Design a protein around this ligand. Structure first.
Ligand SMILES: Nc1ccn([C@@H]2O[C@H](CO)[C@@H](O)[C@H]2O)c(=O)n1
Ligand SMILES: Nc1ccn([C@@H]2O[C@H](CO)[C@@H](O)[C@H]2O)c(=O)n1
Ligand SMILES: Nc1ccn([C@@H]2O[C@H](CO)[C@@H](O)[C@H]2O)c(=O)n1
Ligand SMILES: [Cl-]
Ligand SMILES: [Mg+2]
Ligand SMILES: [Zn+2]
Ligand SMILES: [Zn+2]
Ligand SMILES: [Zn+2]
Lengths: 153, 148, 158
């Protein structure tokens, strides 16, 4: 068959004054991302990438009247991928954040993502890493997400 | 069928008195990428991902950047692989890459003898974080699928 | 034809008084990687990619970052257990690719040995495993030699 891979990347600053929302989940924390859902953006990009449809910013413009939260954008991304003729086979991802502890929220993120993509739960994975106190990530000045997606025509 | 994946990463410093060439496109800008070659960060990343998918080592083991990308494709074919698709991301705070991306994709598809629909190029800023966010460098990431 | 992909990321600080172990190879160096285990950044990145492809969470879920039993743990034994759990989930590994980002030391003389280790631990031929290396072009904490990063991608099939 006609398999394709895509990859995705995103990053946002972490400062006091905003909520922390990752993978559709609000996480109690003294800082927040400037909805800024890094995980969902990275996955969205990975999906557009696999389908060879450009990137998230080309589809969902900052100014566009029609566009909403990152979960809504993920659902629209999936519909556009479906229409291009592709079925999603799996998603894997990594969140790099020095803090807070993300492990408790992983299943919720996975359920949110699988729901939005209409995928069996066992085809969505989310992982978490600190940056070992290195760089802006290790200083808690930002949070990064990475994603990989496999699709088939 | 015998599918393989590869991943590629590259970064280059932005310095004065150099042309900015990304995905074969010369972009007007006060700085350009520093490297031994023409320092095309996107093409190097894709090259590494293709060598990676074919398990042929890396770009430094083997070697303008389009010529090298063409040579990469040759050696991937030499090894018995056909390229199925390529995806990538450019991380640049500045300049605006939007008007240049379609050409980048066209360039890459030409060099890899692939139709446009099997090649993708994406772009992000680094939200003003780190060396990328200060406009000190530009990073590229790539994923490639091949089959034997 | 039930293919899945996974991706992995790891980084560790490079400090004095530690062995430098990357891809299971002990590299002569005045510094080594800091972690709870042997801190093998490449193997941890690959382990993460495999667990990820099989949708089994991540390396910390399986091999606790704070469990004393993993103090100085051999990250190859961890990779072998990962592959065993991936097989138990019903997946065969098809290939692995990876990158190490390091200012120093020179990794080229050790790369083939790293590849052989990973191939052995994953029960794969050499031609299905790849290890790439590069500098960070003097940029950032990696350019200052404060740590070493690895990236990995894996393809499996159920
Ligand atoms: N240096 C850059 C960085 C990003 N972009 C484009 O901006 C949108 C938002 O990421 C995306 O659509 C992306 O392609 C750009 O044109 N130049
Ligand atoms: N710390 C490092 C970084 C890079 N390299 C090798 O140099 C070539 C160009 O990056 C590549 O072939 C790469 O393998 C190395 O041996 N050690
Ligand atoms: N910000 C973070 C960083 C890491 N983790 C979890 O810690 C374990 C070791 O990396 C891993 O199991 C990882 O999931 C976390 O829960 N939150
Ligand atoms: Cl460096
Ligand atoms: Mg990075
Ligand atoms: Zn974002
Ligand atoms: Zn380069
Ligand atoms: Zn590690």
């Amino acid at each position: 068959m006609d398999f394709r891979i895509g990859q995705g990347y995103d990053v946002h600053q972490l400062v006091p004054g905003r909520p922390l929302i990752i993978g559709g989940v609000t996480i109690p924390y003294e800082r927040g991302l400037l909805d800024a859902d890094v995980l969902l953006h990275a996955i969205t990009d990975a999906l557009f990438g696999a389908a060879a449809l450009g990137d998230i910013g080309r589809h969902f413009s900052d100014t566009d009247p029609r566009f909403a939260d990152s979960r809504a954008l993920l659902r629209e991304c999936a519909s556009r991928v479906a229409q291009a003729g592709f079925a999603i086979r799996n998603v894997d991802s990594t969140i790099i954040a020095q803090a807070p502890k993300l492990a408790p929220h992983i299943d919720a993120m996975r359920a949110n993502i699988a729901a939005d993509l209409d995928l069996p739960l066992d085809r969505v994975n989310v992982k978490a890493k600190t940056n070992e106190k290195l760089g802006y990530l290790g200083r808690g000045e930002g949070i990064e997400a990475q994603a990989a997606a496999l699709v088939v025509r």
